[PDB]
Design a protein around this motif. Structure first.
Motif, PDB file in Angstrom:
ATOM      1  N   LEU A 122      -3.888  -1.790   2.551  1.00 42.22           N
ATOM      2  CA  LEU A 122      -3.241  -0.970   1.536  1.00 42.22           C
ATOM      3  C   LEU A 122      -1.828  -1.496   1.314  1.00 42.22           C
ATOM      4  CD1 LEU A 122      -3.574   1.625  -0.246  1.00 42.22           C
ATOM      5  CD2 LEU A 122      -2.433   2.840   1.610  1.00 42.22           C
TER       6      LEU A 122
ATOM      7  N   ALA B 262       4.920  -6.900  -3.214  1.00 46.97           N
ATOM      8  CA  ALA B 262       4.263  -5.785  -2.550  1.00 46.97           C
ATOM      9  C   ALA B 262       4.378  -5.956  -1.043  1.00 46.97           C
ATOM     10  CB  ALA B 262       2.788  -5.681  -2.949  1.00 46.97           C
TER      11      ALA B 262
ATOM     12  N   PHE C 111      -7.020   6.270   1.465  1.00 47.86           N
ATOM     13  CA  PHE C 111      -6.217   6.692   0.322  1.00 47.86           C
ATOM     14  C   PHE C 111      -7.121   7.356  -0.710  1.00 47.86           C
ATOM     15  CE2 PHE C 111      -3.274   5.701  -3.326  1.00 47.86           C
ATOM     16  CZ  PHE C 111      -2.257   6.514  -2.878  1.00 47.86           C
TER      17      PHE C 111
ATOM     18  N   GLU D 143       1.104  -1.864   3.906  1.00 49.77           N
ATOM     19  CA  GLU D 143       1.364  -0.605   4.594  1.00 49.77           C
ATOM     20  C   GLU D 143       0.524  -0.467   5.861  1.00 49.77           C
ATOM     21  OE1 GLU D 143       1.176   2.717   1.636  1.00 49.77           O
ATOM     22  OE2 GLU D 143       3.208   3.049   2.394  1.00 49.77           O
TER      23      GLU D 143
ATOM     24  N   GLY E 125       6.084   1.374  -7.084  1.00 51.41           N
ATOM     25  CA  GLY E 125       5.479   2.593  -6.592  1.00 51.41           C
ATOM     26  C   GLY E 125       3.976   2.687  -6.724  1.00 51.41           C
ATOM     27  N   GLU E 126       3.299   1.607  -7.105  1.00 50.85           N
ATOM     28  CA  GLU E 126       1.849   1.609  -7.229  1.00 50.85           C
ATOM     29  C   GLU E 126       1.213   1.085  -5.948  1.00 50.85           C
ATOM     30  OE1 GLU E 126       0.266  -0.671 -10.513  1.00 50.85           O
ATOM     31  OE2 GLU E 126      -1.728   0.163 -10.137  1.00 50.85           O
ATOM     32  N   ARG E 127       0.067   1.661  -5.590  1.00 51.03           N
ATOM     33  CA  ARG E 127      -0.671   1.277  -4.398  1.00 51.03           C
ATOM     34  C   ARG E 127      -2.017   0.687  -4.794  1.00 51.03           C
ATOM     35  NH1 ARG E 127       2.274   5.548  -2.302  1.00 51.03           N
ATOM     36  NH2 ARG E 127       3.202   5.137  -0.252  1.00 51.03           N
ATOM     37  N   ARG E 128      -2.488  -0.271  -3.998  1.00 56.94           N
ATOM     38  CA  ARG E 128      -3.743  -0.949  -4.286  1.00 56.94           C
ATOM     39  C   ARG E 128      -4.363  -1.438  -2.986  1.00 56.94           C
ATOM     40  NH1 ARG E 128      -3.558  -4.634  -9.875  1.00 56.94           N
ATOM     41  NH2 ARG E 128      -2.908  -2.925 -11.252  1.00 56.94           N
TER      42      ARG E 128
ATOM     43  N   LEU F 183       1.775  -1.554  -1.094  1.00 61.15           N
ATOM     44  CA  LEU F 183       2.627  -0.776  -1.981  1.00 61.15           C
ATOM     45  C   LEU F 183       3.546  -1.716  -2.746  1.00 61.15           C
ATOM     46  CD1 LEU F 183       3.927   2.055  -2.852  1.00 61.15           C
ATOM     47  CD2 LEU F 183       5.498   1.637  -0.964  1.00 61.15           C
ATOM     48  N   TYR F 184       3.516  -1.617  -4.071  1.00 63.68           N
ATOM     49  CA  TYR F 184       4.351  -2.462  -4.906  1.00 63.68           C
ATOM     50  C   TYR F 184       5.738  -1.850  -5.063  1.00 63.68           C
ATOM     51  CZ  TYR F 184       0.398  -5.382  -6.186  1.00 63.68           C
ATOM     52  OH  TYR F 184      -0.664  -6.254  -6.156  1.00 63.68           O
ATOM     53  N   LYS F 185       6.671  -2.671  -5.548  1.00 61.86           N
ATOM     54  CA  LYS F 185       8.052  -2.223  -5.675  1.00 61.86           C
ATOM     55  C   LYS F 185       8.188  -1.098  -6.694  1.00 61.86           C
ATOM     56  CE  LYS F 185      11.817  -4.040  -6.318  1.00 61.86           C
ATOM     57  NZ  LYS F 185      13.163  -4.638  -6.521  1.00 61.86           N
TER      58      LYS F 185
END
Lengths: 271, 46
Positions: free
Chosen positions: A92, A75, A29, A78, A98-101, A94-96
């Motif tokens: 990786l 989250a 990412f 992915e 729309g943020e990725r971490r 994905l939160y509800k």
RNA sequence: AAUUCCUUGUCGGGUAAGUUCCGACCUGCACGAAUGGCGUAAUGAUGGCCAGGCUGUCUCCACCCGAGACUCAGUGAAAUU
RNA sequence: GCUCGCCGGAAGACCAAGGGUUCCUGUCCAACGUUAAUCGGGGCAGGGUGAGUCGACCCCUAAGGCGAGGCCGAAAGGCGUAGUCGAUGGGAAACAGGUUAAUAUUCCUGUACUUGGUGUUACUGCGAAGGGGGGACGGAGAAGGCUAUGUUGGCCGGGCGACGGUUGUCCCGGUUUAAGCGUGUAGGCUGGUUUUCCAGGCAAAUCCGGAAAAUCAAGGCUGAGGCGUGAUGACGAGGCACUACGGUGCUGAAGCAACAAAUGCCCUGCUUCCAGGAAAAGCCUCUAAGCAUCAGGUAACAUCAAAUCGUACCCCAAACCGACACAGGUGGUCAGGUAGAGAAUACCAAGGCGCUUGAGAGAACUCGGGUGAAGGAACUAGGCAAAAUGGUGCCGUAACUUCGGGAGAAGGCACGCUGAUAUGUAGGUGAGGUCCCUCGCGGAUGGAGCUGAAAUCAGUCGAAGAUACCAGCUGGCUGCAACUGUUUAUUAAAAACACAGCACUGUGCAAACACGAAAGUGGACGUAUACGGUGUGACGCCUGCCCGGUGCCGGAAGGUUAAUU
RNA sequence: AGGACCGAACCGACUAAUGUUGAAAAAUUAGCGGAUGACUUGUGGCUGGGGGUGAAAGGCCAAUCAAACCGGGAGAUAGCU
């Protein structure tokens, strides 16, 4: 899975690989990437401060979320990714909103799994809660030494810690080294264990493999001259002195812990 | 056989140039000594 | 024995003849178990030894083709004393 | 000037770095040139380097440097934030032909392109030191489609032979044309469009991300080459008037096809692997504070501007680094023919050279080579050196083994040329024709022409057919080190060093440890499956006895014991 | 696939001869090792003398290294020539 290479040539005879098909076969990412320049073990004075460091493959740093302070927002995992900066894998998520971490990958976490953090989070692997709410005797990883500072303990391939007791505002933990340490009962921890347990079963198999990792060869010290190392030289192989580091320390049982600042959070140091 | 001197104008100026000498207190003393001796060419600038 | 002073130890193999080499013996002057012991396929411009082929390495040198050496013209050094 | 010889993956051509007039013309020969010198990279004088598009400057950043305040340090000074510098990397645009004694993608001719300023007109939400996208990236491998380029045929011009033959399936030469513009192909990637909603992107957002519906399957992006145009031009072998035989005007035929084919292009692609592969700006979008009959934004047309510096010459060398006109060293680019797997090797093309003392003689001896009767390691510390083996296909191949190897083990047989099978085969390439079609650079059929192995049979020449250059000696026993690697630049390359593996030990993170009077930095943007130190050194079978001595790790009673009082 | 195999460029330096007031203050000629990797190379950068760097030879740090070079203390001292 551990796979043994066939001996088609010297240097491949003893190679044992760790192949994980679940890892993502693509680029990472981009928004969570940073430059990571090698140092060669040299500090701002230009002097070698740590020996046996140099070369190796180019690497990019992945911004991993060691704090997990995004409470109350579920989250979904992915994919799992290969991280060259650490022995464990990363996931990786994905939160509800729309943020990725990026987070450390627990043992049995796969794509599509759901994780959450906070006081009210469920007791499931990959969930992060303050250790006050975690039942005693459970296995956790990525433990915080201070509240809100970020996980610092049990971050390696297949490590974990166990919560032994909770008397007051502190919780007693059994670290992988066997030390019995106590920390505030407000530091976050993640349920489960870091999943790469097979990492320790790999066999490099040749000198070149070590060089790929950025490790330079080690010269013993009994092979040097007296001017270079205390182990010095001699006509043949003599070594008639107590083992000692460079700079002259015993390094065969001598303890070097002299912190004494805390000396209160340790109970059963080890062994 | 490769010899010790491998010329490079950029490296010559960066190592012994006029501005390099002025960048440090010790370098400024080199110019003072050369000025006192009456050197025609103070540095390797040109 | 990369370790054995006595020593070319003794016996056997290989040679017409072997202080080296290989295989045994054990009286280990003074081997020995991670300053590791004993084995080990592959690998080595690595040490030792033996064969076939090959030859001027040799018995024992002969001839030939070129560059110097020798003569002529020009230029023109050195150590040492 | 005519011959001869040498290089031709350079000893040819073009650059960077470096040098700095060595470049061209005239003139001179004292010194310089290892000889002479009319000659020269020598002396003296004059001449020569022309850019909006090439490079620098410039915008942007990497390692790293400097560093307002700041933190730290007897002084000097050290580190570092905001910032500012720093290419070896990213960022707009020009091609062909002609021309000088010496410069040209810079001058001339022809034909193009890029970025800004200003003005007019039409239509308009503009706005960043902020958000998002993009820029943007590894190794190896595999083909397919192409071009550079080459070969042959056709075409055009010329030729009819110093000695037998040569009007033909004969000989020589030429057969060249760019950027740009239009077309959007082989092929690669991605499902589009509309509506509603939202804890994310420091605030905002129509942008990015997320969620839920509806509707369509064709949308878009990227893309070598080809074709058309550029070009009724330019170039063009050779002629013809001038021609100080140094050369200039004019004129100037053919200018096509097939086949082969890259290490170059499509390809920053595709497939696959683990060791998991820069940054920032230009660029494209989004809005904030602000400004709204303004200012700004998009498009068209006109006009103006694109400064400054470098540009000669050498650049595998006589001009750079080696004191020399020195058998040395020096990064990038270009890559013809025959044979060949090949950038090896041999002979050649374009092009460039014969290396700045020669002339004779044909002793010993030295150096570099050729051949050798009989013997064949008897030489010698030792087969040192030399001789020898050497290619492709097929047959065949031991002990041992970690089952991969050993192995090209060893050993054996066949290799030229001509004819036929087949007036050139299998294969590759592919025209015309026919048919189809979303009528295009399309698809199917079709087979002309071109190219072309390998094998069998028969014949035939020589002492010899992998004939030259080129091109493994092989086998047996054994010590040591597992292995590929590394090392005393300049007498030692090894059994020495590394090594994967193994073990002990330290280290709970402000980690141990290391560099630092210190701040701080490395370790590490790591966290005990981690990091440091030490010894051992793949793998297989194993690693026994001793804690008195020294060290290290624990112990708590007693004895002894510093400053201090 | 490979620190895989044969072999040019390229990077090395195992043997012999020549040279040794050399063409050369370490090279030439004939063979020789590696040649997709612990590889090799251009440009720039960082580490400074009791210090650096070192797959470790006391190697290398400008033809100099068991403590670089330059200037200074300095006319060090020399029961010795």
């Amino acid at each position: 899975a551990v796979v043994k290479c066939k001996p088609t040539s010297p240097g491949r005879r003893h190679v044992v690989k760790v192949v994980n098909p679940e890892l993502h076969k693509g680029k990472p990412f981009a928004p969570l990437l940073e430059k990571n320049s090698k140092s060669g073990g040299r500090n701002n004075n230009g002097r070698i401060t740590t020996r046996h460091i140099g070369g190796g493959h180019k690497q990019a740093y992945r911004i991993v979320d060691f704090k997990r302070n995004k409470d109350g927002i579920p989250a979904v995992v992915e994919r799992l990714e290969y991280d060259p900066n650490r022995s464990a894998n990363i996931a990786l998520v994905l939160y509800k909103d729309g943020e990725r971490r990026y987070i450390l990958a627990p043992k049995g976490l796969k794509a599509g799994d759901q994780i959450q953090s906070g006081v009210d989070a469920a007791i499931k692997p990959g969930n992060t809660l303050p250790m006050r709410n975690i039942p005693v005797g459970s296995t956790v990883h990525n433990v915080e030494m201070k509240p809100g500072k970020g996980g610092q303990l049990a971050r390696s391939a297949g490590t974990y810690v166990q919560i032994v007791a909770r008397d007051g505002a502190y919780v007693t933990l059994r670290l992988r080294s066997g030390e019995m340490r106590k920390v505030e009962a407000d530091c976050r921890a993640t349920l489960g264990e870091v999943g790469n347990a097979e990492h320790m079963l790999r066999v490099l198999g040749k000198a070149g493999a070590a060089r790929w990792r950025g490790v330079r060869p080690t010269v013993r010290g009994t092979a040097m001259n007296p001017v270079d190392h205390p182990h010095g030289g001699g006509e043949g192989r003599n070594f008639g002195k107590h083992p000692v580091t460079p700079w002259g320390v015993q390094t065969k049982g001598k303890k070097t812990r002299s912190n004494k600042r805390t000396d209160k959070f340790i109970v059963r140091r080890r062994s | 056989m490769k010899r010790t001197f491998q010329p490079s104008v950029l490296k010559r100026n960066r190592s012994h140039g006029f501005r390099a000498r002025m960048a440090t207190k010790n370098g400024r003393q080199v110019l003072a000594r050369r000025r006192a001796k009456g050197r025609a060419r103070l540095t390797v600038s040109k």
